[PDB]
Motif scaffolding. Structure first.
Motif, short mmCIF file in Angstrom:
data_model
loop_
_atom_site.label_atom_id
_atom_site.label_comp_id
_atom_site.label_asym_id
_atom_site.label_seq_id
_atom_site.Cartn_x
_atom_site.Cartn_y
_atom_site.Cartn_z
N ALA A 9 23.27 -28.42 -13.33
CA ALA A 9 23.95 -28.56 -12.20
C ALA A 9 22.78 -28.22 -11.18
O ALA A 9 22.12 -27.26 -11.48
CB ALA A 9 25.14 -27.27 -12.37
N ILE A 16 17.93 -25.44 -9.57
CA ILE A 16 18.77 -24.87 -10.63
C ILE A 16 18.82 -23.58 -10.44
O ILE A 16 19.44 -22.96 -11.31
CB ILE A 16 18.41 -25.53 -12.00
N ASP A 21 19.24 -16.19 -11.71
CA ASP A 21 20.60 -16.68 -11.66
C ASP A 21 20.93 -17.92 -10.97
O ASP A 21 19.82 -18.47 -10.69
CB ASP A 21 21.41 -15.38 -11.03
N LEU A 22 22.00 -18.48 -10.70
CA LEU A 22 22.09 -19.83 -10.07
C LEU A 22 22.06 -19.33 -8.64
O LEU A 22 22.17 -18.16 -8.20
CB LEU A 22 23.42 -20.41 -10.60
N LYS A 54 13.93 -19.18 -23.36
CA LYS A 54 14.21 -17.85 -23.24
C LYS A 54 14.73 -17.19 -21.60
O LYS A 54 15.63 -16.44 -21.63
CB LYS A 54 13.12 -16.92 -23.58
N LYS A 55 14.36 -17.97 -20.91
CA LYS A 55 14.91 -17.45 -19.45
C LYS A 55 16.39 -17.60 -19.17
O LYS A 55 16.99 -17.16 -18.53
CB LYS A 55 13.89 -17.67 -18.18
N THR A 56 16.78 -19.02 -19.70
CA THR A 56 18.12 -19.40 -19.68
C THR A 56 18.84 -18.44 -20.42
O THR A 56 20.09 -17.81 -19.99
CB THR A 56 18.41 -20.68 -19.91
N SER A 59 19.70 -15.34 -18.91
CA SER A 59 20.77 -15.11 -17.49
C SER A 59 21.97 -15.43 -17.83
O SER A 59 22.66 -15.47 -16.97
CB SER A 59 20.00 -16.43 -16.54
N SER A 76 11.01 -20.42 -27.74
CA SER A 76 9.88 -19.53 -27.16
C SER A 76 8.70 -19.41 -28.04
O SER A 76 8.67 -19.77 -29.29
CB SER A 76 10.69 -18.12 -27.23
N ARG A 77 7.75 -19.35 -27.56
CA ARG A 77 6.49 -19.13 -27.97
C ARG A 77 6.28 -17.69 -28.41
O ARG A 77 5.22 -17.50 -29.21
CB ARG A 77 5.47 -20.08 -27.72
N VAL A 115 20.39 -26.97 -22.29
CA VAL A 115 21.06 -26.50 -21.32
C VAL A 115 20.07 -25.90 -20.54
O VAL A 115 20.26 -25.47 -19.21
CB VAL A 115 22.37 -25.65 -21.92
N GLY A 117 16.06 -24.34 -19.64
CA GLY A 117 15.49 -24.83 -18.25
C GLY A 117 14.71 -26.07 -18.05
O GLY A 117 14.66 -27.17 -18.70
N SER A 118 13.88 -26.11 -16.92
CA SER A 118 13.07 -26.85 -16.24
C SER A 118 12.25 -27.76 -17.41
O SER A 118 11.99 -29.05 -17.62
CB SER A 118 12.06 -26.44 -15.52
N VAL A 120 12.08 -27.25 -20.41
CA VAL A 120 12.91 -27.71 -21.70
C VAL A 120 13.54 -29.15 -21.12
O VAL A 120 13.70 -29.85 -22.26
CB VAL A 120 13.75 -26.81 -21.92
#
Ligand SMILES: NC(=O)C1=CN([C@@H]2O[C@H](COP(=O)(O)OP(=O)(O)OC[C@H]3O[C@@H](n4cnc5c(N)ncnc54)[C@H](OP(=O)(O)O)[C@@H]3O)[C@@H](O)[C@H]2O)C=CC1
Ligand SMILES: CN(Cc1cnc2nc(N)nc(N)c2n1)c1ccc(C(=O)N[C@@H](CCC(=O)O)C(=O)O)cc1
Length: 186
Positions: A9, A16, A21-22, A54-56, A59, A76-77, A115, A117-118, A120
């Motif tokens: 989205a 994004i 958060d969004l 990991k940041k998604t 959130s 994640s590394r 799903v 993030g970026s 990724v």
């Protein structure tokens, strides 16, 4: 292992996320569709796999973690073990997909959903092979801090339609958006 798909989205400004958060107010139908798409399996006894950085993962409201009816994987590394609630942890998108090939999972998983993030999205998006991008186009500008990579239109085609996806402008809380699907194969 069936389909490889991305889901996002984005706002008119290609954004994004904003501070974990969004950028936008929560659109519950938007979330509805997200859940419907990623959770529905076209094959009995098989499940969908969700791949997120990991940041998604961090959130998603605690209470909704791990996303239900879905096999959840974090990328994640840094982390040694999957964060509490997660089912799997991988150090790469290539590793995560290989695991799909493991007999453990080889008979439990139908489609795999990315799903975000970026970082990724960017890599999957460029992954050799057949792929589809389900994009919700949030129709206004929202101040963001994280963006969606550009769609290479010379590789990715927009479909005129797609089964189970509304083709008309949605609007909720005064925020209009449309659902789109791009398809690739290279
Ligand atoms: N509107 C939307 O559709 C969406 C919005 N969002 C929102 O946007 C943000 C998510 O942002 P983003 O910063 O991109 O975060 P990510 O969720 O991609 O978190 C990045 C972390 O994930 C790991 N990682 C990511 N990609 C890879 C890879 N290919 N291989 C290995 N590890 C990888 C790294 O972990 P380590 O540092 O452990 O190595 C990196 O620090 C939040 O604001 C979230 O709420 C998120 C998804 C979709
Ligand atoms: C921060 N975030 C990432 C997020 C949000 N909207 C998106 N929307 C789309 N289209 N694609 C994405 N990849 C996406 N990702 C979230 C936040 C909460 C939930 C969540 O709690 N999901 C429930 C849906 C619950 C609900 O219906 O509100 C689920 O069961 O999947 C998911 C993603």
């Amino acid at each position: 292992v069936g389909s490889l798909n991305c889901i996002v989205a984005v706002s008119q400004n290609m954004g994004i996320g904003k501070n974990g958060d969004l950028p936008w107010p929560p659109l519950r139908n938007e979330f509805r569709y997200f859940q419907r798409m990623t959770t529905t399996s076209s094959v009995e006894g098989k499940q969908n796999l969700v791949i997120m950085g990991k940041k998604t993962w961090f959130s998603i409201p605690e209470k909704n973690r791990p996303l239900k009816g879905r096999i959840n994987l974090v990328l994640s590394r840094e982390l040694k073990e999957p964060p509490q609630g997660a089912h799997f942890l991988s150090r790469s998108l290539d590793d995560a997909l290989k695991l799909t090939e493991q007999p453990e999972l080889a008979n439990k998983v139908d489609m795999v959903w990315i799903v975000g993030g970026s970082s990724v999205y960017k890599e999957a998006m460029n992954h050799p092979g057949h792929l589809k991008l389900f994009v919700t186009r949030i129709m206004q500008d929202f101040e963001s801090d994280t963006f969606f990579p550009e769609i290479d239109l010379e590789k990715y085609k927009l479909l005129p339609e797609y089964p189970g996806v509304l083709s008309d402008v949605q609007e909720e809380k005064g925020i209009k958006y449309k659902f789109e699907v791009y398809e690739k194969n290279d």
